[PDB]
């Protein structure tokens, strides 16, 4: 096939400084002029938004205290990037303010940039609950040992000894993850944000019982908000396309991936009562002969 | 009895890699054309189906905790493999979905590709009751011992002391089997799925008594319903094909079996009174002169 | 059971959580006979 | 070419080098054009590209 | 059946201290990463009420 | 060389080795060829194949 | 009757609440005659 060799932007430059994929010329005729043209398409396919992805960057500090380290951080971890059922609540927008005057008694008005600002990130992660309640005893043993404690106001680590002071900076009880929304080919990352001093904020996980013993066993849905302080710009865009070259796809096949199983079971085999078994053992092999 | 030597494609690539048996060129000059041609009508040779062949592939490990877990497994064994009358529910289409934009105002539209997705499998069992009535025994004890018992929902097998903990995992009472769709010869896999997580949903056997001394006794049929996670790929065709490799039928002879009868009973040859024993006592023999 | 998506290809997870049985409404049938012995004995029953 | 459910991307980028403008119609479209000619099949009375 | 050993925690430490049954080992892959892999579904297994 | 009721397989594919392709009519179809001849035999009226 | 379940299998226990009797609509059907006797009848017999 063919198109238009002017479709796409030949450098990507101006207000294209640092995109990273193939960015499409605006310059080419659209299809709300007079009249819609043919020849141009291509250049008509729409932008359709992909999932975001989460990276996890820092680990709080007060994992160096614990019996094992290892093991808390490897939990965060899987709960912030694999568990993640669904994630809301980014959002870097604009604003802009003006101050306002007549021009004249008619109704007209002249209009002055008086200021302009961002919008913020609330970041809500949310999962689902398994056997044993792995993910809301990880989340309120977080709460209560590495922040506060109800009945005391006081962090339930510090009943050990040698605990170091400035325990009371975020350092010690805080992460970083960066996001990134990637191509439909997930290549190129198109938009990115990196928030710091994140943990968690307004309630914890649900923890109410009853009983009813007429209803079915029903799932628990667990949901959590935290707090932030997010940077977006270009630099930001280069480290989530640095974290996105990586993750590579070569090679990947997923309808040439072995099965799980390779072969039946040991026990299976042992009963010769199947299908294949009347063949090998019952029915009598005399030959063919016509 | 020839035909061209381009009918059959010269080796399985491309859109037919990873296939087991012949495959057409689909280049041949086909029909539907300005004319047909009968130089090529060997291609016009259509698919029919056939039907499926399950092969159990694993056992419930809840088998172990009772009594003759081999006679469990074996009954489910036949069940599955030889007892099954039907099986239905199996489907794995794809799916797309695009969108939608104005071209213009004149009604034309352009779209572009957003998701594609894939149906489902819901495994359908059916079989019809024997003397003594030992499948619809088979599958409520099954569902009361294994899975729950309905006053208390908890498992009649915990009652047995030494019930191991993580019971409640799927690999305790599921199990998995292998679906081929074979061609006509039965000597190469044509389609395959690989469903685990399986064990029943929804009714049981039917369980309903009637009085009426006038109607006339019926049959009973059993129809069960499983869930599962189905897989599909060449990982999978390639493990159909060497689970269909074996049942091989070489050296054998559907018209050539033994009569199940090698001879009259005793009792038969006992009374001495019918075709033979004319010839034999009852008829004189003064010899033959003609 | 319940259920929870296996990733977003439209593949599904289900989880056991309930067994129940199912419940008995006995219903007889009769025929009447001279007299009526059968809807005198059940309206006498009722009622007393 | 077009999807693969578990990821929604398409197989093929599982090679190396695939070009980065993968993603616009011309890589995975075609074009076809319908012609209903006379009884003759010498002339076409209608269109459609 | 088979199942892979370290599905379920070997030991109840850290922040699974006390805990009674058999919980999860929580860095099994999910589902909802760049794709599942069905060599861990025995990990998925649900909680109900 | 075609279907057996009870299993719906052809018997010959009880011997090993018989190649691919037994699905083809070529393997298990044949040919005829039909004349009209005159009252002397010698020219031919009407045929099909 | 009222039902309340008699533990969480499926089960029903029933305790007896009420009993009633039916009612009774009387509908008679005649054929007119000449002179449309029945007719004036009824109609008169409402009307005055």
């Known amino acids: 096939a063919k198109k238009d060799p002017n479709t796409i932007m030949s450098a990507n430059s101006s207000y294209a400084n640092g995109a990273n994929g193939s960015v499409t010329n605006l310059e080419i005729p659209a299809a709300f002029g007079y009249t819609p043209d043919f020849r141009y398409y291509h250049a008509a396919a729409d932008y359709t938004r992909r999932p975001t992805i989460a990276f996890l960057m820092e680990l709080p500090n007060c994992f160096k205290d614990t019996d094992d380290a290892a093991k808390w951080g490897g939990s965060l971890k899987a709960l912030i990037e694999m568990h993640s059922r669904t994630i809301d609540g980014l959002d870097y927008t604009l604003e802009v303010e003006h101050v306002e005057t007549p021009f004249g008694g008619g109704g007209e008005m002249m209009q002055t940039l008086s200021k302009v600002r961002r919008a913020r990130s609330v970041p809500v992660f949310t999962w689902v609950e398994k056997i044993g309640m792995p993910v809301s005893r990880f989340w309120n043993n977080y709460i209560l040992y590495f922040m506060g404690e109800p009945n005391s106001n006081v962090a339930g680590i510090i009943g050990k000894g040698g605990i170091t002071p400035a325990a009371t900076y975020p350092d010690y009880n805080t992460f970083s993850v960066l996001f990134v929304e ?14 710091t001093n994140m943990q968690p904020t307004g309630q914890g996980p649900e923890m109410r019982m009853s009983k009813d013993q007429t209803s079915s066993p029903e799932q628990l849905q667990i949901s959590q908000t935290f707090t932030g302080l997010q940077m977006v710009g270009r630099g ?13 796809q070569t090679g990947i096949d997923l309808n040439a991936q072995p099965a799980f199983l390779s072969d039946r079971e040991a026990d299976v085999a042992a009963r010769t009562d199947g299908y294949i078994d009347q ?12």
Do not use: C
Not at 281 to 290: D, E, F, Q, R, T
């Open 182 to 195: 990637p191509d439909p080919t997930e290549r190129y990352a198109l938009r990115s944000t990196l928030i």
């Open 236 to 248: 930001v865009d280069k480290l989530g396309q640095m974290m996105l070259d990586r993750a590579s």
């Open 279 to 290: 063949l090998v053992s019952s029915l009598s092999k005399p030959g063919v002969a016509i």
